[PDB]
Enzyme design. Structure first.
Site, mmCIF file in Angstrom:
data_model
loop_
_atom_site.group_PDB
_atom_site.id
_atom_site.type_symbol
_atom_site.label_atom_id
_atom_site.label_comp_id
_atom_site.label_asym_id
_atom_site.label_seq_id
_atom_site.Cartn_x
_atom_site.Cartn_y
_atom_site.Cartn_z
ATOM 1 N N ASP A 181 0.826 -1.214 0.000
ATOM 2 C CA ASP A 181 0.000 0.000 0.000
ATOM 3 C C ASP A 181 0.861 1.265 0.000
ATOM 4 O OD1 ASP A 181 -2.612 -1.249 0.008
ATOM 5 O OD2 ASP A 181 -3.175 -0.412 1.953
ATOM 6 N N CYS A 215 -2.577 0.903 -13.433
ATOM 7 C CA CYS A 215 -2.620 0.882 -11.962
ATOM 8 C C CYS A 215 -3.812 1.774 -11.588
ATOM 9 C CB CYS A 215 -1.287 1.292 -11.367
ATOM 10 S SG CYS A 215 -0.479 2.771 -12.105
ATOM 11 N N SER A 216 -3.710 2.678 -10.592
ATOM 12 C CA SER A 216 -4.823 3.602 -10.374
ATOM 13 C C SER A 216 -4.788 4.793 -11.345
ATOM 14 C CB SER A 216 -4.849 4.079 -8.917
ATOM 15 O OG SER A 216 -6.097 4.723 -8.673
ATOM 16 N N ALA A 217 -3.667 5.537 -11.390
ATOM 17 C CA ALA A 217 -3.542 6.661 -12.327
ATOM 18 C C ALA A 217 -2.916 6.268 -13.661
ATOM 19 C CB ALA A 217 -2.711 7.813 -11.726
ATOM 20 N N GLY A 218 -2.275 5.110 -13.741
ATOM 21 C CA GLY A 218 -1.624 4.702 -14.976
ATOM 22 C C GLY A 218 -0.303 5.384 -15.288
ATOM 23 N N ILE A 219 0.441 5.823 -14.268
ATOM 24 C CA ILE A 219 1.754 6.450 -14.490
ATOM 25 C C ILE A 219 2.875 5.959 -13.578
ATOM 26 C CG2 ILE A 219 0.682 8.509 -15.480
ATOM 27 C CD1 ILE A 219 1.148 10.005 -12.901
ATOM 28 N N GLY A 220 2.559 5.527 -12.362
ATOM 29 C CA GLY A 220 3.573 5.126 -11.407
ATOM 30 C C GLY A 220 4.054 3.690 -11.506
ATOM 31 N N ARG A 221 3.348 2.751 -10.856
ATOM 32 C CA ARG A 221 3.653 1.335 -11.065
ATOM 33 C C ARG A 221 3.651 0.977 -12.549
ATOM 34 N NH1 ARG A 221 -0.483 -0.803 -6.325
ATOM 35 N NH2 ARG A 221 0.244 0.734 -4.788
ATOM 36 N N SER A 222 2.693 1.529 -13.315
ATOM 37 C CA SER A 222 2.616 1.243 -14.761
ATOM 38 C C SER A 222 3.881 1.696 -15.483
ATOM 39 C CB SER A 222 1.397 1.928 -15.383
ATOM 40 O OG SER A 222 0.137 1.383 -14.997
ATOM 41 N N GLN A 262 6.524 8.082 -10.317
ATOM 42 C CA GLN A 262 5.882 9.131 -9.502
ATOM 43 C C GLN A 262 6.691 9.588 -8.299
ATOM 44 O OE1 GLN A 262 1.671 7.193 -9.247
ATOM 45 N NE2 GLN A 262 1.344 9.391 -8.931
#
Length: 284
Positions: A181, A215-222, A262
């Site tokens: 998390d 992912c949630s925003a599509g920029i970090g983990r993605s 991010q």
């Protein structure tokens, strides 16, 4: 410079925040006018995360062609990816319309539906074989075919039917379920194992449309997923693998979608994943 030595240099001097802010300052700024139109407000999860106009995926419909999704085309590596936000209650039909129209074989999901006590994306696939989903706004049917639950990820086989034409296609859903998390994983071993399972499936290969990753925003983990994959492929293709510069690859990807990677912690973790993954690419 060998990234492994670059890594130790930054680590000993504790300058990750400085390196990361340099990337933020040099990153591309292109218009995102379609994302900001009033008619599209409930199609965006976050006000400050939008696709650029030049690289956005267009839905094949005359009504409203907008989805929060971007085509990342890596020319030297010969890989393409679609990076998108986690689907919203009002955009699950659009999401599967995109998968159909772009001829994708795989969807890569890097978040859980609920994290930190809040919803990070809609429940957009069926959880039981006998309870299929119908998306009436886009005329698609989606059925769960099989599910394989492992300790660090789940792989699902799905059937997507275009109800207008009765064509069907098999879609593979690769769900990484153990990203913490807060922060990033301590070791990149399970994330690399997951990446190699996606590769082995064919979902990243040129005979199919681009993989859809979110992912949630599509920029970090993605961003971490596509950056690691592209850097490892370049080290395999080039005569001199130590010439692969992860910061330059990241800035190239940021020409196609804003904000990829991010935090400074995600940047360090991307270095660690590429360094450890190379010890297979190079023949072990």
């Amino acid at each position: 410079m060998e990234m492994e030595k670059e890594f130790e240099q930054i680590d000993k001097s504790g300058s990750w925040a400085a390196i990361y802010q340099d990337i933020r300052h040099e990153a591309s700024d292109f218009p995102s006018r379609v994302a900001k139109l009033p008619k599209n407000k409930n199609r965006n999860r976050y006000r400050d995360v939008s696709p650029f106009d030049h690289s956005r995926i267009k839905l094949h419909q005359e009504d409203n062609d907008y989805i929060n999704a971007s085509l990342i085309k890596m020319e030297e590596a010969q890989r393409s990816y679609i990076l998108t936000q986690g689907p919203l209650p009002n955009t699950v039909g659009h999401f599967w319309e995109m998968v159909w129209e772009q001829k994708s074989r795989g969807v890569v999901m890097l978040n859980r539906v609920m994290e930190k006590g809040s919803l990070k994306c809609a429940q957009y696939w069926p959880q039981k074989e006998e309870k299929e989903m119908i998306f009436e706004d886009t005329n698609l049917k989606l059925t769960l075919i099989s599910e394989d639950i492992k300790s660090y990820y789940t792989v699902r086989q799905l059937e997507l039917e275009n109800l207008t034409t009765q064509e069907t296609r098999e879609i593979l859903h690769f769900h990484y379920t153990t990203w913490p998390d807060f922060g990033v994983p301590e070791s990149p071993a399970s994330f690399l194992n997951f990446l190699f399972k996606v590769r082995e499936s064919g979902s990243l290969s040129p005979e199919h449309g681009p993989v859809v990753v979110h992912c949630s925003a599509g920029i970090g983990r993605s961003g971490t997923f596509c950056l690691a994959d592209t850097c490892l492929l370049l080290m395999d293709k080039r005569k001199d693998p130590s010439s692969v510069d992860i910061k330059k690859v990241l800035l190239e990807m940021r020409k196609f979608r804003m904000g990829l990677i991010q935090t400074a912690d995600q940047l360090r973790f991307s270095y660690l994943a590429v360094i450890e993954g190379a010890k297979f690419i190079m023949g072990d």
